[PDB]
Amino acid sequence: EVDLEVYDAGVSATAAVGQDATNDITLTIEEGGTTLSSPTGQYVVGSEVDINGTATSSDSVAIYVRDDGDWQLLEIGGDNEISVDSDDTFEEEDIALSGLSGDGSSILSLTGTYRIGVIDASDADVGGDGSVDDSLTTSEFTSGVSSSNSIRVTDQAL
């Protein structure tokens, strides 16, 4: 719950710390939702797929992949982020997850069942420069607003 306090006319800023508020108003603030839709269920190794999902309260989002350890960052490319429209939806063009350069993509190259999740810009290099450049652990990834879904990679076909 968040409150707003007003003060009588003519009061100074410094002198208003102790005096009681003439009136007040309160509002509630909750955390939004950030989920992925398309990178779910199945994935052919080496194939290209789009990034589909929604983000109610987000500006920059990053995609991470985890398998028995750290969440290795996936280098999507330009600025490692996706903007969100007014409809609380973010999208990306067709991207080959394994094709792209980075150690994050290397986990998905081998056949198996893994996990992929998205996270808002609340990380911001877990404190520092305004860029998503880390490999957030389980505690760091879960602490912020995020969501993950199970994914498994299937070998190629013809």
Binding site: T113, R115, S139, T142
Partner: protein, 249 residues
């Protein structure tokens, strides 16, 4: 009126504890809460009660040692003085909540038993016959962090802890924890005989009873032995359950 939220009567992280306090304090302006252990260390904090006398302060850290910690809630009565104002080191009739904090700093400095502090605190403030102030008492064992799986069984009626689950029907898993209900989460992992994970679910809500339940479907599961793994950034518990086509009933 006061209350303390304990996951199992204990606070798991000794280094950084956390308790939630709420209650009704009508007619008061501030409420003081004190924590003392068996050694004799003391931690205090004042709580600003709102207009309608319903104070609720959340995420209160405890900087005491491992063991048993008893908690007290202080409230100045009608006199708006701590008891009679007769502090051993404070002035007369000026004994407020802030004034009593100065007296607390002398308690931990001296080599006093934690049990002695219980006698001293009650005697100097409440046990005095002319005192009008009120307190409430609560205790909890400050132990280390805990996270464990208690019972796994299908939607049927069972509480023993282990039950084979037929594929196609949802099965519930129940475990105990001491973490904060919202600031933390429990992630599960279900893996087959050769490290093929099949399920992954997380929960970040559970009442003050400490019990949490996680739902996973068995639609595409295969009969055999499956491993259930739960972690929260701390010690990880593992349990194994059997999967059968149909159960005996």
């Amino acid at each position: 009126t006061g209350q303390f939220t304990t996951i199992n009567g204990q606070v798991a992280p000794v280094e950084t504890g956390t308790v939630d306090i709420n209650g009704t304090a009508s007619g008061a302006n501030s409420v003081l809460v004190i924590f003392v252990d068996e050694r004799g260390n003391v931690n205090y904090q004042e709580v600003s009660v709102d207009s309608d006398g319903t104070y609720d302060e959340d995420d209160i850290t405890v900087g005491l040692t491992q063991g048993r910690v008893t908690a007290h809630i202080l409230s100045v009565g009608r006199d708006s003085a701590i008891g009679d104002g007769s502090l051993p080191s404070g002035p007369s009739n000026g004994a407020t909540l802030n004034d009593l904090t100065g007296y607390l700093d002398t308690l931990d400095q001296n080599n006093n038993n934690g049990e002695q502090i219980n006698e001293l605190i009650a005697s100097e403030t409440v046990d005095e016959t002319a005192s009008d102030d009120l307190i409430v008492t609560e205790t909890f064992r400050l132990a280390e962090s805990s996270t464990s799986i208690d019972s796994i069984y299908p939607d049927a009626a069972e509480a023993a802890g282990i039950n084979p689950v037929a594929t196609g029907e949802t099965m519930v898993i129940a475990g105990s924890t001491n973490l904060k209900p919202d600031d933390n989460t429990i992630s599960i992992e279900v893996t087959n005989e050769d490290g093929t994970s099949v399920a992954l679910e997380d929960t970040d809500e559970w009442n003050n009873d400490g019990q949490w339940m996680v739902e996973i479907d068995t639609t595409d599961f295969e009969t055999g032995t499956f491993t259930v793994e739960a972690d929260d950034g701390d010690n990880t518990d593992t349990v194994n359950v059997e999967v059968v086509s149909e159960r005996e009933d």
